[PDB]
Amino acid sequence: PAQNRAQKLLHYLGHVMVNGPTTPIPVKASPSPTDPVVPAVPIGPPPAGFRDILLREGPEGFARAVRNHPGLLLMDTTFRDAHQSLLATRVRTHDLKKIAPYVAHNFSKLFSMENWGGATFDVAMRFLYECPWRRLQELRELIPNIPFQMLLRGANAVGYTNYPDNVVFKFCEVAKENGMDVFRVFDSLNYLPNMLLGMEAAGSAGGVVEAAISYTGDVADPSRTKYSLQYYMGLAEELVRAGTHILCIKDMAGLLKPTACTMLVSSLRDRFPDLPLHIHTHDTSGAGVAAMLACAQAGADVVDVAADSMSGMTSQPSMGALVACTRGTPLDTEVPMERVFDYSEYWEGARGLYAAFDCTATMKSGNSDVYENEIPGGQYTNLHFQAHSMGLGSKFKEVKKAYVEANQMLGDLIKVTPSSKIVGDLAQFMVQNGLSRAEAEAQAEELSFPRSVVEFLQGYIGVPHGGFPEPFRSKVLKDLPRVEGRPGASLPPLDLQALEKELVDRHGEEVTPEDVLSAAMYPDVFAHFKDFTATFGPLDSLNTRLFLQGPKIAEEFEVELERGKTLHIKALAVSDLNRAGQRQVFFELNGQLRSILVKDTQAMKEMHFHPKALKDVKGQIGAPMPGKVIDIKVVAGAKVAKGQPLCVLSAMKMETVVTSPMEGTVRKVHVTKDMTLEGDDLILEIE
Amino acid sequence: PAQNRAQKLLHYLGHVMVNGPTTPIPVKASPSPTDPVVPAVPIGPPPAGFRDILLREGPEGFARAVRNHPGLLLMDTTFRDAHQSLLATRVRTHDLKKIAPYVAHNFSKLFSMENWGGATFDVAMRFLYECPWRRLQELRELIPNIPFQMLLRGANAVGYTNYPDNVVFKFCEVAKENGMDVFRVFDSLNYLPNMLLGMEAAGSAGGVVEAAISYTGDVADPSRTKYSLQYYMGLAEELVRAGTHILCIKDMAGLLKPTACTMLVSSLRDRFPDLPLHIHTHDTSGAGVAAMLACAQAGADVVDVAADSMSGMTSQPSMGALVACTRGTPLDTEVPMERVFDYSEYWEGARGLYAAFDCTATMKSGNSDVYENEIPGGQYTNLHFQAHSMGLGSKFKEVKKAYVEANQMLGDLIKVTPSSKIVGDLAQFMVQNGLSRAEAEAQAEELSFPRSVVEFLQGYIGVPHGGFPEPFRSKVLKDLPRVEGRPGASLPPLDLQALEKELVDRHGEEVTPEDVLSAAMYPDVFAHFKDFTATFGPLDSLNTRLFLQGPKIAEEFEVELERGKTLHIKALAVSDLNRAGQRQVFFELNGQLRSILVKDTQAMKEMHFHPKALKDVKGQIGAPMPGKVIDIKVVAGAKVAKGQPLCVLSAMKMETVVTSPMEGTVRKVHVTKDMTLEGDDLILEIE
Amino acid sequence: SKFKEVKKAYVEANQMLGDLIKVTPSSKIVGDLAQFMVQNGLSRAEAEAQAEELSFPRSVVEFLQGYIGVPHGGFPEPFRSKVLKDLPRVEGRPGASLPPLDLQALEKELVDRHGEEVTPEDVLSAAMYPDVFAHFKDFTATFGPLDSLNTRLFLQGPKIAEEFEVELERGKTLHIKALAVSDLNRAGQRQVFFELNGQLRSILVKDTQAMKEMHFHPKALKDVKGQIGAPMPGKVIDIKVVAGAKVAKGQPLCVLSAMKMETVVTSPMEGTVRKVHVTKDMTLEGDDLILEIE
Ligand SMILES: O=CCCCC[C@@H]1SC[C@@H]2NC(=O)N[C@@H]21
Ligand SMILES: O=CCCCC[C@@H]1SC[C@@H]2NC(=O)N[C@@H]21
Ligand SMILES: O=CCCCC[C@@H]1SC[C@@H]2NC(=O)N[C@@H]21
C-alpha cells in the first residue's frame, strides 16, 4: 500500500478550515500565533541521572540512592498533572518533544519526570488523536537519563472501569518495556486490595513501586476523626509491609497545611527512617510552596513541582520558588535558577497555544475555599466547564456547596479520579433538580441518580473507608446487583490473543501489543482513534496552532514528517459548496497546486425538537439531561413496573438509564434510536 | 447657579458613545457586563477596632496595643497597592464604597487598611476624574473603626518632585483632618534626611508615624555587601532614634526569601523588643506567603495581605492563605475564613470590570526572575505597557536584562517609585538605541539620557547610599546644576493663600484646602481635573462599566446622584455627523426624551508626517521619541554649541530636552510648537 | 416567459368567444381566457371540447351569462350552453331588470359611518365602487390628504436627512425633514423621527416586513380527480361545503378572490367531501389542496 500522509494531512487542514476545530473548544480564546522559543541545548549525550542508577542497581538500589541524597530532590509534573490541571490535559506530543532535550541536559538530577498516566492516555487518543505509547517512546529516547513516572490506578491502570487482573499486569509489563520507570500506585478510596494488585503488577514488571496514599481531611484538626493521623500511619504500615520502594502522600486538592505537613511527614519519617518519602500537592489554596517547604523540613526526600509558567492555581507549586527558597540550606536542590527561567519561558509561550483550554478563563488565582469543598485541581476545571455546558455556570457557587453536601451524603470518601467525578455529578444533579441533601436522602428511592453514583454504590470502584452510607445505598440500589470485595477479582481473564486477531482482521498486520492494550482498556476510543488516523494521518507532525485552528488563507508553513522529509504547505482558497455538499480546498504543497474536497456540515443546519414533559404529569417521562438515545427498552402497549428501565441516554460520556417513576402501560414512545434530546424532552407517556 | 448634573452625566455618556473611553485602555479586553455582588452587612454600627484605641490613647497608645496583641495582626492593602500592582491603580471610589460597610463589620480587628498611598492621588484625578480627598472622606464614614493607612514619600508627600517643607507639613495636617491615621513614611533611596522630614510632618499632624525601610538585595547572601544586614540595622537605629511609632520593612519587589526574613526580623526584634514590626512584601516570586509566615515566626507583629482575588503575582500575599496557615497556632489572626471568601468573591467580580487594565493580559503568574531584575510590582506592569507602546514589546526580555545593567550603571540604588522608573527609562533607552552598559558609560558625554535619569543624577530625588556613580554622573551632567543635600530645603515656602485666591478667581468660591493642596502638588492635573468635572459632572456616581465603555443602544440603567435622587437613563440612538462635526445622542431620562450634541474627532482624524533624520548625517537632528513639541529653543541661522538645548518634547509624561550633538549653525527647523512627532522625525538641520 | 403564447391564445380566445369587439371590459374577458388556456396547456379545440368540465374565469362566465350586453352576431353556441349549464342567463339589457338604488338610504348609511361631511359625489362613488370607496375613506381617515405630497414622496417616502415642502392650502406650507427610524419595539412598531417646521416630532408605525413567516402545506395530485387544487393563487373568501357533505358535479365548493375577481371553485365529480384543508381568509398558491372528494 502506497503511503499517502501528505494528502491525509492536507485533508485534515482542509477539514479544519471548512468545519472548524475537531477538538471541542470550551472557551472563545485563540491559540498564540507565535510558536514557543526552544532554549539552546548542548551538543552531546545528556549528563548521567537517577535513571542510570535505576538501570544499574534496580528499584531497591534507586530507592536507597534517593534516601541517601543530600538535599531536596525535585520531580517535574509539568509534563503530566500540571497541564491536566491547567489546560485539560491538552498538551501535545509535538510541544513536549521540542523541550525534552533541554530537560535531559539541564535537569539530569530530577528524581523523576511525571509525563505519563492519569488522564493523558485517554485524552491523547480521544481529543489529540495521537498515540500515548508513541509519546512515551519518543520522549524516552529524548530523555535517556531521567526516570519516567506515571500515575497508575491500582486495579484499573489508566482506565475508568475495573479490568481483569491479566490486563493490569500486561499493561504494567508493556509500560516498563516502553521505558516507564516509576509507578505511582494509588486508589481513589485508598482501598488497599486495589492498591496491592497495582503494586504487584508494577513490581512484577520490574518497575519502581511508589505506593501513594490519597490525602483528605485535616490531620491537624482534632475534630476530623475519620481521616486522622492514625488512619494515615496504619495505611502506611500496610503499604510498607506490601513492599513499596517509595511512600507517596498524594494531596490531590492542596489540603495539606504547613502544620499538617510537619505532623504527618515527621510521624512517617520517625516510623520509617530508611524509606524514601515523596510528597505531592496542588497549589489550589495558594499555600502549596509553604506546604512543600514544611514537608522538606519534616524529612520528605522528594516534592512534586511544575515549571513556573505551568505552576500555581490548580497545578503544583512553582519549581523556581522551591529552588530559590532552599538555596544555600541543607535542603538545596542544586538546580541553577537560570535553567528554571529558560524552562518556564518556553512553557509560557507553549501555554499561549492552549489559551482555548486554560483554567484562567474561569479561575484567575488559587482559591482557599478548597479547604471547605475539597475539589481536586483537575475536577475543579472540569466541573466548571460541565456546569457551563449545562446552563449552571451562573450557579457554580451552589454547585460547590452541593459538592460538600454530596461528599457527606456519599460518606466523606477520598475525592480523586473517579470518586471526585462521582461527587461532582451528584452535586450537579442536586443543583439541577433544586434538591437539598435532606430531600435527596429522603427521596432516594424515587430519584434517578447519575450512573457514576449508582456504579459507586454498587461497589464497582472498591469499598470506601468506613463502608457505604446506609440506608442511602440500599434506597438508591433497590434490587440492583452489588459487588462484594475487589471488582476485578470476579472478572474472567481477557483473551488478548483473540483481541489481537480481531484488531489485525480490522486494521491490518501493523497491530502492536500497545494497540491491543489500548483497545482492551478503551475499545470505543481506540476504534475511533484508528478510524480518525486512517483518514487524517499523523497529526502529531502538525504544530499545535495548525492542529487546533488550521491555516489561514495565504499562510505558508512547514511540516516535518520524518528526518529530512519536510512539507512546504500554503493554503490558497476554499470554494463554495458543490451539489454534493462539499467544498474544494486549494493548497500549494512543495511548489505544486493540490485540491481536496471536504464536506461541510455547518453549511446547512436545520434540526427540530418538539417533545416536552409536563412536570405535574407523573406519566410524562422527560429526558433527565441533554443526550443521545442509545437504546429504547420499551414499546407502546408494554406494561412497566416502578423502577423498570425505559431508555438509555448517552450524554457527557455517561450512559444514564431512564427508569419508570410509576407502574402503568406505555401509551406512546416519542423518541427514536440515535435521536438527540434536550433536557425535559418527552421520551414517553405512561398511563 | 442652577446645578446641571444629570445633563453633564448624559454629556459624558454621549461623549463615550461617540469618541470611546476617556481613560487610555492598554489592552483589548472589555469590562464585565455584570456588577459585583455585595455581601450582606449587619444592620448597626460596626464593632470597635484598633482605631478606637488610636483615637482614645494617641499614636503611642496604638503602637503599644499593636505590640501587646496576641497573634499576627493583618492589614488590608486591597484598597491600594493591590490594585496599583494588578490593575494600574484604576479601581474607583464607586467599587471601594460598595464593599466598605462589609469590611468595617467583618474585619474590625485589622491593624489598618491601606488605601491612600502613592499613585492613587494622581491617578484618581488624571485618569478616573474623581477627587482623592472625597474618596478618603466617604470611605472613612463607611469604615469608622479601622485605622486608615497611606504610603507617604518623606520629602515629596504623594507627588513626583520635591516640594517646599510647608506644603509637605500642610498636606499631612489636612490628610489627618480628613481621617488618615497611619503614615507609612518611606524614601525611594532610603535617604534619611527626606524620611525625617516626612516623619516630622506626619507626627506634627498627630498621625501614627510608621518609618519604612525599602528592602533591596539579599541579607542572606554574604556576597552582597552594599545592602547587608548591618545596613538595615544601622538605618533602623536612626529611624527609632527619630521617634518612629512602628518600624516597617518595605519589600516593594518580593525579594525577601524566608531565610532572609528570619534573619532580618529576628535581628530587629532582638534590638527593639518593644517596637511594633510591620512587614510589607509582594508575591512577585510566588514565595510571598512563605516569606510572611517566616516574618511572623521571627516576631513580626503585622504583615501586609490582599483579598485572595486581588492577591498574588505583583500584588501582596493572599489574606485567606495567611489566615488558614496561622489558624490554631500562637499566630492565629482570629479572622473567620467564610468572611475572607465573601470578600474575595466580591473582588473577583469587581476585578472583572477592570479586565482592560489587568496585569494578567501580560503576566500569567508570579516570576522568580524578580530575584535577578529586582523590578517592583507596579513598575513591572507599567514598564511592559510602555515597552509595548514604544514597539519594544517583543524585546521585553532585553528590557529586563537592560534593567539589571541600568541599576548597576546607576549604582545599584533601591528601586521603588520614582527610582524604579528612572532605572526603567534608562533600560528602555539602552534597548531602543542598541547600547550595552559599557557603550552607554563610554559615550555618556555624547548621549541624550532620559530626563528622569538626568534629574536623578542632579540630586533632585536625594542622595543614593554609597553616593552617585563617578565618572558617569559628571559625564552625563557636564555643566548642569547639581543639588547638594535635601532638594526641598533650598525651595522657598509656597504661598498657599495666594494659590487659594488664584483658584477662587478661576473656579469660584467652592475651593477647599484639599483643592489648594491638590493644585500645589499637581497643578496641571488639578486644572485638567476641574475643567473635565466642570464639563462632565460627578463621574464617581457612574458604575465602572458605564464609566469605561458607556451604555449600549437600548440599554437602561440607574444612577444615584444623592440619597433618594436616582436617574433612570436609557440610551436610544446616535445620529449621523452634522455640518458642525457633531453627532446628536438621544437618551430617555426619567421617562423623558433628552438629546445632547457630542463631537466625533474619530471621524475626521487625519494627519501627515513628512520629516526624517538620516542616522549617518550628524547635522540632522531626529526626534529621540514620539512626543509633542512643547518648546523650540532655536531659530534658523542661530549658532549652537555642542550640548545646547534645541527643543523640548513632552512624551510619556516626561519633558525631554533635545540637545545639539555638534557645534554649528542651524540651517533649518522642520517642527512647530504643539507638533506631534514620531521617532526619528527630523527636528532641525545643523551645518 | 410565455407571453408570446398568451398573445396567440388571445387570438384563439377571441375566435372561441365569437370575435367580439375588444375594449374594457371585453378585452379583459378575452385576456383572462387566453391566460387560462396557456396556464392549463389548452388549445382552442380542447377548451371547446371540454367546455362542460372546465372551470372558466368569472369574467368569461359573466360575459356568457349576458352581464355586459349581447355581442354582434349573438353568443357562440354550443360553447355558451356548455360553459353555463344551468347558470342564470340575462336576456336584453342587464341594467333594465335591476331595481332602482335608494341613494338617500345610501347617503344616510354613509353619514352614519363617516360623519356629516358626505357629499353627492361620495354617494355616487360608494354606489359604483362600494368596497373601494370604503377602503379609500378608511385610508384617507388614517393618512390624510395624500394629493398634497409630490409623486416621489408619495411612492417612495423621504430619505434620512431629506428636507422638503408640503403645501396643504394656500399660505400653509409644512417644511419636513426625515431624521431617523428606530429599531422594532416590543409592540412590533418602529418609531420614525421627523422635524416639522423646526420641531422634532415622532410617530410609531408598525412593521409587517419585520416578520412575515407563513407556511403552505397543501397540494393536489393532478391524477387524483377527487383532490381539488386551487386553480389560482388567491384568498379564500367563502367555503360552501363541509366534511361529510354530498356534492354534485358542478356544485360550488369555495370562492377564491385573486386579481380582483371572485372565482367559484366547482366540483369536477359527484361524491362525498372527505376533508376540507382550507379556512376563510387563507391565502392559497396554485394547486394548493382545497378539499378531498370520495
Ligand atoms: O470529558 C470527559 C472526561 C475527560 C477526562 C477527565 C479527566 S479523567 C482524569 C481526571 N479526573 C477527573 O475527574 N477528570 C479528569
Ligand atoms: O503614565 C504615567 C504614570 C502613571 C503613574 C505610575 C505610578 S507612580 C507610582 C508607581 N511607581 C511607578 O514607578 N509607577 C507607578
Ligand atoms: O388591477 C386591476 C385592474 C385595474 C384597472 C385596469 C383598467 S380597467 C380600464 C382598462 N381596461 C382594461 O381592461 N384594463 C384597464
Swiss-Prot record, chains A, B:
Species of the source: Homo sapiens
Assembly mode: Homotetramer. Interacts (via the biotin carboxylation domain) with SIRT4.
Protein name listed in UniProt: Pyruvate carboxylase, mitochondrial
Residues with Phosphothreonine modification: T512
Cofactor(s) needed for function: biotin; Mn(2+)
Modified residues annotated as N6-carboxylysine in this record: K250
Disease annotated for this entry: Pyruvate carboxylase deficiency: Leads to lactic acidosis, intellectual disability and death. It occurs in three forms: mild or type A, severe neonatal or type B, and a very mild lacticacidemia.
Compartments, as annotated in UniProt: Mitochondrion matrix
Reactions catalysed according to its record: hydrogencarbonate + pyruvate + ATP = oxaloacetate + ADP + phosphate + H(+)
Cellular component annotations (GO), alphabetically ordered: cytoplasm; cytosol; mitochondrial matrix; mitochondrion
Swiss-Prot record, chain C:
Residues recorded as bearing N6-acetyllysine in the entry: K8, K85, K108, K177, K206, K240
Binding site for substrate: T24
Compartments reported by the entry: Mitochondrion matrix
Phosphothreonine modification, residue list: T119
Segments forming domain Biotinyl-binding: 225-294
N6-biotinyllysine sites (modified residues): K260
Assembly and interaction partners: Homotetramer. Interacts (via the biotin carboxylation domain) with SIRT4.
Disease connection: Pyruvate carboxylase deficiency: Leads to lactic acidosis, intellectual disability and death. It occurs in three forms: mild or type A, severe neonatal or type B, and a very mild lacticacidemia.
Function, as annotated: Pyruvate carboxylase catalyzes a 2-step reaction, involving the ATP-dependent carboxylation of the covalently attached biotin in the first step and the transfer of the carboxyl group to pyruvate in the second. Catalyzes in a tissue specific manner, the initial reactions of glucose (liver, kidney) and lipid (adipose tissue, liver, brain) synthesis from pyruvate.
Name of the protein: Pyruvate carboxylase, mitochondrial
Classification lineage: Eukaryota, Metazoa, Chordata, Craniata, Vertebrata
